[PDB]
Amino acid sequence: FVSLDSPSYVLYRDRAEWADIDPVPQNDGPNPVVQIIYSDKFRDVYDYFRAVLQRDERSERAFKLTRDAIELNAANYTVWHFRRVLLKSLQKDLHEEMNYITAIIEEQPKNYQVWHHRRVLVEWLRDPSQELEFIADILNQDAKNYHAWQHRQWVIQEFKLWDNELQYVDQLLKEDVRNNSVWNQRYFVISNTTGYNDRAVLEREVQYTLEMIKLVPHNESAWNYLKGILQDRGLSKYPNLLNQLLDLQPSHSSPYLIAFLVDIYEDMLENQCDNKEDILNKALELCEILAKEKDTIRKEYWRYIGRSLQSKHST
Amino acid sequence: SSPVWSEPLYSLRPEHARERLQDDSVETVTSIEQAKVEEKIQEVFSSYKFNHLVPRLVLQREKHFHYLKRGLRQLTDAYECLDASRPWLCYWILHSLELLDEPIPQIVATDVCQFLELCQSPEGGFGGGPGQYPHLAPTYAAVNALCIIGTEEAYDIINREKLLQYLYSLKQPDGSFLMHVGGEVDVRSAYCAASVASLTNIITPDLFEGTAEWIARCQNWEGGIGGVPGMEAHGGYTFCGLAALVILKRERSLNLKSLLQWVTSRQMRFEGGFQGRCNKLVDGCYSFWQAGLLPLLHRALHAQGDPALSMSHWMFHQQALQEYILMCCQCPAGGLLDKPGKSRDFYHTCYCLSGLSIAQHFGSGAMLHDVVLGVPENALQPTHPVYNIGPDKVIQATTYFLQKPVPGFE
Ligand SMILES: Cc1ccccc1S(=O)(=O)N(CCN(Cc1cncn1C)c1ccc(C#N)cc1)CC1CCN(C(=O)OC(C)(C)C)CC1
Ligand SMILES: OC[C@H]1O[C@@](CO)(O[C@H]2O[C@H](CO)[C@@H](O)[C@H](O)[C@H]2O)[C@@H](O)[C@@H]1O
Ligand SMILES: [Zn+2]
């Protein structure tokens, strides 16, 4: 009807159609703390909100009022809950409400309440048809929006919309191969579709990741993904990988590569590798290099790893 | 060594320049943003160095105190966005004062108790302000604030019978909790529930059935924990997950090796502070959410007999974190912040200080080892890494409530 910023906006206390209900002031007590000196407009809306809440008035006027209360503080989860009570009670058009939440999220994309409200609507409608495109628009503005990714994961899993997500992941990795949210989505899609037990899939993934590392060797996300998809079977189960990394070491001795070597050596020692004394020596040398030179921010961690190796494998 | 009036800093070592981002000549939004922050931070670091003269760093306690004291009574309409978070303002401010060892006048303490009573819902739990529905986040904040006050008056505000019923009313069959009635699920709720239930002695055998397993499902391939299963590892949700498991004595449900490697990786080699997720920017509040994981991991590993654990240091760069907070996160007007160029707020004041205290104080068994960077007055009161209130307050509250029965249960 009329928005809070509109030139013709009128305070609820001045609206004839609200004259029959008394506003309910907030009681902060006789000696208030963390007391917010509200604007007149804010207090007016919330005094009337408290009134309709207290009376449990399930009306169209109350519904319109929640829209204003939300604009004033979209983190007010009490208002959101009441708005949902009204959506059901008044049998409001949920597609119209979807248009509303779409606009609100675009304005406030980091807010928990707006995303939860959208999920409730999609659940009520059992209609995911606008979701992937809407989320992609939000992600086009902030490609790391945690709420947007979480909602995307929910929609895909709940409505089984897996078919195009790896292609979407690939597009976003082309745009920013350092986008850790997208590497996480890659794992999400593959683990939930083919899995990584298919040796052809794992090889494709290892190859792809090694290629990304070659292109951008100081990108931590690709290194973490490489470890992520190999770690549960055990890094030492992949003997060729060690050789390949060892070849790159002299020319690409980044802390990420050196750390990865230690991780391999750790797992090797845990699995009765051949030449244990030699492998232990090499691992301790790398821990020292990391602690003293290549990764000094993590000196305490690398010193711990060195002591841990010795506690487990010295013999 | 050096005269007492000069203290060399890690971030000012000549080799520290080697820690600047290497973008491999491949620019993306991520690297561009990271480089911009590093450039600003280098400018800041340099401002604290005068060739071989490096004056001791100073926590501006008095400025922070005045900012906090003012916020505890009154706020402009600029704070309307926190109108459903007033118990948070109470907790962030009281905990900051507590860390700074600034006494809370009895009158202020009573007024806070009275206000939090008004935020308590008849259905149990606390809401964001008087008459608001309850929600686990302001419930956590209110309970923590009342424990910081720590008077019998404060403790007795809490309606424990209704609190327990309220937690039940949020508990899902899969072990998770809603944040509020009809609200969203993520690992925040497990921590809020576990924190308030353990402090107030209302844990039943069934309350947390399945919860540890659900939290473990939130640990992902990176080794950290996401908000729900499948999601990206995030320092805030990781703190929530591990802290809840520590309360439940179920830390072993996680892969602690991958968790430890993930969190230590989140300390930024150049800035010295922590990022919340891999390949995102440094932020002062993660001084708590990330660095606070290290004392939790230490306790967990120590419980398992780990013979390699340090007896003197947490497994992060304690000095570097202190340098980032003291040089980059203080507002000259009082208050602390995310990073240079950002504006102060009470949330960053709370968590920057909490992280500073973790970085200054190591304790395990009978071993205590302090590393207070800068002037000795910089030393803060210790904070409990599970609850993030003083350990004295935790012991006092837990002792008080353990004398009361679990509501309706034996
Ligand atoms: C950190 C975190 C941890 C777990 C889950 C979510 C988050 S967060 O998304 O980053 N966010 C912080 C929102 N944030 C935004 C932010 C913080 N740092 C950078 N930004 C953009 C704020 C919050 C308050 C104020 C104020 N005043 C300013 C900024 C949520 C806060 C909500 C209230 N909190 C909270 O309930 O913490 C529990 C769950 C541990 C009890 C503290 C975290
Ligand atoms: O960090 C790996 C560690 O986390 C666990 C859960 O505690 O599993 C997570 O990571 C796996 C990939 O390594 C995923 O398949 C799984 O879905 C996720 O929960 C441990 O099993 C694993 O060692
Ligand atoms: Zn922050």
PDB file of N, CA and C and ligand atoms in Angstrom, chain A residues 187 228 231-232, chain B residues 216-217 219-221 223 255 258, ligand 2:
ATOM      1  N   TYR A 187      32.732 -30.759  -4.129  1.00  0.00           N
ATOM      2  CA  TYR A 187      32.694 -31.942  -3.289  1.00  0.00           C
ATOM      3  C   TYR A 187      31.257 -32.355  -2.997  1.00  0.00           C
ATOM      4  N   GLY A 228      41.511 -33.295   0.476  1.00  0.00           N
ATOM      5  CA  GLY A 228      40.162 -33.681   0.896  1.00  0.00           C
ATOM      6  C   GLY A 228      39.646 -34.939   0.215  1.00  0.00           C
ATOM      7  N   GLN A 231      42.201 -38.085   1.471  1.00  0.00           N
ATOM      8  CA  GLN A 231      42.589 -38.331   2.861  1.00  0.00           C
ATOM      9  C   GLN A 231      41.919 -39.531   3.521  1.00  0.00           C
ATOM     10  N   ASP A 232      40.681 -39.823   3.174  1.00  0.00           N
ATOM     11  CA  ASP A 232      40.025 -40.877   3.923  1.00  0.00           C
ATOM     12  C   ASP A 232      40.530 -42.271   3.572  1.00  0.00           C
TER      13      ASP A 232
ATOM     14  N   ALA B 216      29.098 -34.074  14.161  1.00  0.00           N
ATOM     15  CA  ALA B 216      30.161 -34.712  13.394  1.00  0.00           C
ATOM     16  C   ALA B 216      29.858 -34.727  11.892  1.00  0.00           C
ATOM     17  N   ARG B 217      28.587 -34.896  11.525  1.00  0.00           N
ATOM     18  CA  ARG B 217      28.196 -34.838  10.105  1.00  0.00           C
ATOM     19  C   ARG B 217      28.462 -33.457   9.488  1.00  0.00           C
ATOM     20  N   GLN B 219      31.217 -31.733  10.090  1.00  0.00           N
ATOM     21  CA  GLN B 219      32.624 -31.592   9.747  1.00  0.00           C
ATOM     22  C   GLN B 219      32.738 -31.996   8.291  1.00  0.00           C
ATOM     23  N   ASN B 220      33.483 -31.232   7.490  1.00  0.00           N
ATOM     24  CA  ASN B 220      33.565 -31.532   6.058  1.00  0.00           C
ATOM     25  C   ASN B 220      34.968 -31.929   5.611  1.00  0.00           C
ATOM     26  N   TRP B 221      35.141 -32.035   4.291  1.00  0.00           N
ATOM     27  CA  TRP B 221      36.402 -32.491   3.704  1.00  0.00           C
ATOM     28  C   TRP B 221      37.575 -31.589   4.067  1.00  0.00           C
ATOM     29  N   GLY B 223      38.095 -30.226   6.994  1.00  0.00           N
ATOM     30  CA  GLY B 223      38.474 -30.551   8.385  1.00  0.00           C
ATOM     31  C   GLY B 223      37.788 -29.642   9.393  1.00  0.00           C
ATOM     32  N   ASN B 255      37.162 -35.910  13.509  1.00  0.00           N
ATOM     33  CA  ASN B 255      38.537 -36.153  13.112  1.00  0.00           C
ATOM     34  C   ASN B 255      39.312 -34.947  13.619  1.00  0.00           C
ATOM     35  N   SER B 258      42.300 -33.550  11.187  1.00  0.00           N
ATOM     36  CA  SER B 258      41.939 -32.688  10.070  1.00  0.00           C
ATOM     37  C   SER B 258      41.425 -31.338  10.585  1.00  0.00           C
TER      38      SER B 258
HETATM   39  O1  LIG C   2      37.760 -33.775   7.648  1.00  0.00           O
HETATM   40  C1  LIG C   2      37.529 -35.121   7.251  1.00  0.00           C
HETATM   41  C2  LIG C   2      36.814 -35.880   8.362  1.00  0.00           C
HETATM   42  O2  LIG C   2      35.446 -35.375   8.541  1.00  0.00           O
HETATM   43  C3  LIG C   2      34.531 -36.500   8.564  1.00  0.00           C
HETATM   44  C4  LIG C   2      33.447 -36.318   9.657  1.00  0.00           C
HETATM   45  O3  LIG C   2      33.979 -36.239  10.978  1.00  0.00           O
HETATM   46  O4  LIG C   2      33.860 -36.638   7.289  1.00  0.00           O
HETATM   47  C5  LIG C   2      33.669 -35.412   6.592  1.00  0.00           C
HETATM   48  O5  LIG C   2      34.586 -35.321   5.501  1.00  0.00           O
HETATM   49  C6  LIG C   2      34.459 -36.432   4.571  1.00  0.00           C
HETATM   50  C7  LIG C   2      35.542 -36.214   3.517  1.00  0.00           C
HETATM   51  O6  LIG C   2      36.843 -36.493   4.085  1.00  0.00           O
HETATM   52  C8  LIG C   2      33.051 -36.465   3.942  1.00  0.00           C
HETATM   53  O7  LIG C   2      32.895 -37.620   3.085  1.00  0.00           O
HETATM   54  C9  LIG C   2      31.986 -36.492   5.034  1.00  0.00           C
HETATM   55  O8  LIG C   2      30.684 -36.338   4.434  1.00  0.00           O
HETATM   56  C10 LIG C   2      32.232 -35.361   6.032  1.00  0.00           C
HETATM   57  O9  LIG C   2      31.288 -35.437   7.109  1.00  0.00           O
HETATM   58  C11 LIG C   2      35.433 -37.729   8.777  1.00  0.00           C
HETATM   59  O10 LIG C   2      34.817 -38.917   8.242  1.00  0.00           O
HETATM   60  C12 LIG C   2      36.651 -37.341   7.936  1.00  0.00           C
HETATM   61  O11 LIG C   2      37.797 -38.099   8.330  1.00  0.00           O
END
